[PDB]
Amino acid sequence: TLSILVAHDLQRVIGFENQLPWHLPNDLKHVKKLSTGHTLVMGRKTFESIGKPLPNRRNVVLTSDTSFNVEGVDVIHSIEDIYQLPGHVFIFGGQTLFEEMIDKVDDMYITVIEGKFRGDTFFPPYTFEDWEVASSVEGKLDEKNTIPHTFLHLIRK
């Protein structure tokens, strides 16, 4: 299976100045639960903003840089390489990879952040006419998670 994994706000903002505009620990645990034991594919800027590979799963970075070699990271240089990765593969970001892959993935795990943040990078527009809602779960709010959010699993019709 080839899936998108993304958190975007009410206007589809995903990032600002190579960081996330929000901090939402529940969403990072969502990422950890979905992706532990599988594969993440991310663009070079997304990788550099995380700084290190995420533990207990395969980290694949797409870059044109043939000098890229990071301990604990597999490197690919073409979109077509993604289709050779075995197992459950999550397209992890950022804007460039989401734009390149949204028409190719089987399904999307989207966290809708119910706020309007300042952004400079966006998830591409999509319509529910193309996507069935396999599940929709409101995130629980607490002291450490103060922004309303919803976990959507969307499957291509």
Ligand SMILES: NC(=O)c1ccc[n+]([C@@H]2O[C@H](COP(=O)([O-])OP(=O)(O)OC[C@H]3O[C@@H](n4cnc5c(N)ncnc54)[C@H](OP(=O)(O)O)[C@@H]3O)[C@@H](O)[C@H]2O)c1
């Ligand atoms: N909210 C979320 O769910 C989420 C998730 C992830 C990231 N983000 C945010 O998204 C933003 C980054 O997005 P972005 O679009 O600027 O960057 P990005 O997609 O993370 O990385 C772009 C880079 O990926 C490489 N790349 C992409 N397509 C390629 C291809 N077809 N062939 C070879 N290399 C390719 C290139 O690297 P080279 O230039 O090295 O060749 C390109 O410069 C940040 O703000 C980050 O915080 C948000």
Ligand SMILES: CN(Cc1cnc2nc(N)nc(N)c2n1)c1ccc(C(=O)N[C@@H](CCC(=O)O)C(=O)O)cc1
């Ligand atoms: C900046 N970044 C990219 C990022 C952030 N939120 C997302 N949220 C969703 N839904 N999808 C993504 N693609 C996504 N990507 C990050 C930053 C930190 C960690 C991280 O430390 N995750 C730990 C969990 C951290 C924790 O337990 O609090 C993990 O094991 O995956 C993940 C991605």
